[PDB]
């Protein structure tokens, strides 16, 4: 039996989001890619450095906003710009969100030497696609 990135049926009480409810064979049929850059296009360079950056950014944001992220990040690259789109929860105070946005945007711009923006979308609770 295949295992890769499959949430397995339980007793019908496990809430899954739309992203985690779709197995890998749907990545270009029902769900899209969580990162969009040019590295993996034909004749394009630096796929390796883009990949390492994505892995770091996903871990940095998970620990920088502990318990706030409601779903996976969407990493966007346009030219020199890096745009991080995060769906967060409405539990942490707004003051603390603004502090962390100013802190993460500055710290990441100096680390990867590019203009970095963080776009937060707040949800009251995790969006449940189905109960498995």
């Amino acid at each position: 039996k295949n295992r890769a990135a499959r949430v397995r049926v339980s007793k019908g009480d496990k809430p899954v989001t739309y992203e985690e409810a779709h197995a890998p064979h749907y990545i270009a049929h029902r769900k899209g890619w969580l990162s969009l850059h040019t590295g993996n296009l034909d004749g394009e360079d630096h796929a390796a450095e883009r990949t390492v950056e994505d892995v770091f950014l996903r871990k940095f944001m998970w620990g920088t906003f502990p318990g706030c992220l409601a779903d996976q990040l969407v990493l966007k690259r346009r030219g020199n710009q890096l745009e991080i789109c995060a769906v967060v929860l409405r539990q942490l105070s707004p003051h603390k969100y603004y502090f962390l946005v100013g802190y993460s945007e500055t710290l990441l711009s100096y680390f990867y030497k590019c203009p970095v923006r963080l776009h937060l979308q707040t949800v009251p609770s995790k969006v449940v696609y189905k109960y498995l």
């Binding site: 707004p94 500055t106 707040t122």
Partner: protein, 154 residues
């Protein structure tokens, strides 16, 4: 037969962006652009407006404090063209010799206490300090009232 080639048109690097910016007007339904465009994060009062920006500025200062405290972590330059503004800043004097030329650095760094102490040491050693260098020290001392300029943290 002769063909007339048009004269070239030259503009600044930001001119095209400024032309596109003129076409749009302020969106009345939105709060100022500096704020996060989200119902939960949008400021809902005049006080929140000030505090939300102050929190964002505090975050930026904390990041800058870390960047300058640990330059090593932000010294890998992968940008082309190189971006000077996104590199760490070094505020400490790198010339440790006691000389007039080494003193000029501390005045450029605006180290009021270091410069005065070094100027005194230089004078005690008996080496010559140029009038221009002494005048530069007075400018630094007179402007700041013989007090250290504010810094991020000690």
């Amino acid at each position: 037969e002769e063909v007339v080639i048009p004269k070239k048109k030259t503009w600044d690097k930001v001119a095209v962006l400024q032309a596109l910016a003129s076409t749009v007007n302020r969106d009345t339904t939105a709060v100022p652009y500096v704020f996060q465009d989200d119902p939960y994060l949008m400021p809902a009062s005049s006080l929140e407006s000030r505090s939300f920006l102050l929190a964002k500025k505090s975050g930026e200062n904390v990041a800058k404090f870390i960047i300058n405290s640990y330059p090593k972590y932000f010294q890998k330059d992968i940008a082309e063209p190189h971006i000077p503004c996104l590199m760490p800043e070094y505020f400490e004097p790198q010339i440790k010799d006691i000389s007039e030329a080494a003193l000029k650095e501390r005045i450029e760094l605006r180290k009021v206490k270091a410069s005065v102490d070094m100027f005194d040491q230089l004078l005690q050693a008996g080496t010559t300090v140029s009038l221009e260098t002494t005048n530069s020290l007075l400018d630094l001392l007179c402007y700041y009232g013989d007090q250290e300029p504010s810094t991020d943290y000690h």
